[PDB]
């Protein structure tokens, strides 16, 4: 929200739309260079209101530079992927029950997996203590998850060890 990411975002997606504009990448280059100067003369003034003003002017002047189908790299939401594979992600709590036959189909996996079940079954008391300790009243101010000081796990780990993309 600060001037930093405001300006820097406008710069970044400005380069993005500019990418989508031209072709052969060289014209994109020296145009992007003229822009590099267009923001390069900037930033050397600590005057307060003048700046945000001129920025907004770059918000309209930028908004002119949007053609409706800006280039979107595949993995983010966009017309290529954004979880093409999503029917392939099966959470590890499934397979908690397979048939003991098929549980014997792959005999050594559930060994280590059992070392995890004990890893985090032994845990969560250390976790709840550390968290209930650290949180300021209500835990309002922090969306973060600070680490553990004693030797061991980082407390809210379980979902953060994920089924991976394909």
């Amino acid at each position: 929200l600060t001037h930093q990411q405001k300006v820097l975002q406008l710069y970044k997606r400005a380069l993005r739309h500019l990418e989508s504009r031209c072709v052969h990448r060289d014209k994109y280059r020296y145009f992007a260079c003229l822009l590099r100067a267009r923001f390069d003369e900037h930033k050397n003034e600590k005057d307060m209101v003048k700046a945000t003003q001129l920025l907004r002017e770059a918000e309209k002047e930028f908004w002119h530079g949007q053609h409706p189908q800006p280039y979107i790299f595949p993995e983010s939401p966009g017309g290529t992927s954004y979880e093409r594979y999503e029917c392939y992600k099966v959470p590890e709590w499934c397979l908690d029950d397979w048939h003991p036959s098929e549980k014997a189909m792959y005999p050594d996996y559930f060994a280590k997996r059992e070392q995890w079940k004990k890893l985090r079954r032994e845990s969560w008391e250390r976790e709840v203590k550390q968290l209930q300790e650290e949180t300021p009243v209500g835990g309002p101010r922090t969306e973060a998850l600070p680490p553990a000081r004693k030797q061991g796990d980082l407390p809210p780990l379980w979902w953060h060890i994920v089924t991976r993309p394909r």
Partner: protein, 459 residues
């Protein structure tokens, strides 16, 4: 017919006297053994409707509907278990007893010759259902939606008895056979007005026309799955059925009197078909679906072309199996996560990869897929109604598009798009679920080979 009346009545003490843990086995077994002879019931031939005994007989329509009932008990009861599977024995034997007795009065009703026996057995059918859904319905606040539900029925459902007895003493016999051949034209005037309106609206309360359709949704969300497959697979087809028969008389009257109701059903088909699109809480979707198809049925009844009946009855049966099954899917999804709310969980193409095929297959059979009996019936009905009015196809086919949209929308967002991953409960399938689904679809797909069984008396 009496050979079908005894074996269930004997199926009552089979329940009552038995060792614990064998009640489901005994009931299911002998009930399917009933279903065999229910399939024996088809001798029907030529012209005269077969008559077993002077008290009650069967024409065609009664035979498909009856076969559907006696087939439906074992699957129903088969489905109701594990809804509880913990209680005192008295609860179990009471519940199975109630399903039995309900089936008995249903067989009475469909087979009944004489309309007063039909009527007595009619409300006598309604009571057991009420006891089922109210005594334990999972009772969200209970809504008191069994009882004043019975008031929704009787409120205007009683005076049809009056009108009947009038028909009795004027013409003598209320036997349906002799009410046929003696039926005499009734001119359009104000007395025949209140009469026709009496009988008509009296049955029209059951298959909900768009005016009264508030009847179903609450009663059908409060129903335990057995009471649901009872309710929407059958108890509407009673109203439409009796409608089929008592429209024998009222010959000219049903034109000038029909027209407003036809209008209301052609518009309400679209309206209901719409409102069922946007709702949450899956258990309701299939309900309003039932309201839609039943509106289509009423449309088929009032216009008297034989095509209209063939498609009509075909829609009674096909919608019976389809709607019933689809309910049982909603339930099989409900035991997994306790919601009733559709949007809550998702996925289940990943998980339960087989249960997909039954979701898909059933939804398609409610999508009006061409070989499916649902599209046979719906198709002939559309033919009849287009014959009646060249214009009405805008509304009809518009119902085609909407019914497509929600029928295929249910197939998604329950079944597809992501796993909500905070669930971690659902236990893969069952053999019983597959048994239920199979017992639904497999006959509905086979009937799509030799349908001439299920097409109506006129054929």
């Amino acid at each position: 017919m009496l050979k079908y009346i005894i074996p269930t009545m004997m199926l009552m003490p089979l329940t009552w006297l038995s060792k614990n843990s064998m009640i489901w086995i005994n009931t299911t077994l002998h009930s399917l053994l009933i279903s065999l002879t229910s399939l024996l019931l088809l001798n029907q031939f030529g012209d005269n409707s077969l008559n077993f005994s002077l008290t009650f007989f069967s024409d065609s329509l009664s035979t498909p509907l009856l076969i559907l009932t006696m087939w439906l008990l074992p699957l129903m009861l088969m489905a109701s278990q594990h809804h509880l599977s913990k209680e005192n024995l008295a609860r179990k034997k009471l519940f199975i007893s109630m399903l039995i007795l309900l089936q008995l009065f249903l067989i009475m009703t469909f087979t009944a010759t004489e309309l007063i026996f039909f009527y007595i057995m009619f409300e006598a059918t309604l009571v057991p259902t009420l006891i089922i859904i109210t005594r334990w319905g999972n009772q969200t606040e209970r809504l008191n939606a069994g009882l004043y539900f019975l008031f929704y029925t009787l409120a205007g459902s009683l005076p049809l008895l009056v009108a009947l007895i009038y028909i009795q003493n004027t013409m003598g016999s209320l036997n349906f056979l002799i009410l046929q051949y003696w039926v005499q034209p009734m001119p359009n005037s104000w007395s025949n007005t209140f009469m026709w309106l009496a009988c008509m609206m009296a049955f029209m309360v059951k298959m909900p026309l768009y005016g009264l359709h508030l009847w179903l949704p609450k009663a059908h969300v409060e129903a335990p799955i057995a009471g649901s497959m009872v309710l929407a697979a059958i108890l509407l087809k009673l109203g439409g059925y009796g409608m089929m028969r008592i429209t024998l008389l009222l010959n000219p009257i049903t034109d000038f009197m029909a027209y407003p109701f036809i209008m209301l059903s052609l518009w309400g088909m679209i309206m209901t078909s719409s409102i069922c699109l946007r709702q949450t809480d899956l258990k309701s979707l299939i309900a309003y679906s039932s309201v839609s198809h039943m509106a289509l049925v009423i449309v088929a009844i009032l216009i008297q072309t034989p095509w209209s009946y063939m498609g009509a009855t075909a829609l009674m049966i096909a919608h019976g199996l389809t709607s019933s099954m689809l309910f049982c899917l909603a339930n099989s999804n409900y035991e997994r996560v306790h919601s009733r709310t559709m949007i809550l969980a998702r996925g289940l193409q990943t998980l339960l990869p087989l249960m997909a095929a039954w979701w898909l297959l059933a939804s398609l059979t409610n999508l009006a897929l061409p070989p499916s009996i649902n599209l046979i019936g719906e198709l002939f009905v559309v033919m009849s109604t287009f014959s009646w009015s060249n214009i009405t196809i805008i509304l009809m086919g518009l119902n085609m598009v909407i019914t497509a949209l929600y029928s295929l929308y249910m197939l998604i967002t329950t079944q597809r798009g992501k796993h909500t991953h905070h669930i971690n409960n659902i236990l893969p399938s069952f053999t019983r679920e597959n048994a239920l689904m199979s017992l639904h679809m497999l006959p509905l797909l086979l009937l799509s080979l030799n349908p001439k069984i299920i097409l109506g008396p006129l054929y």
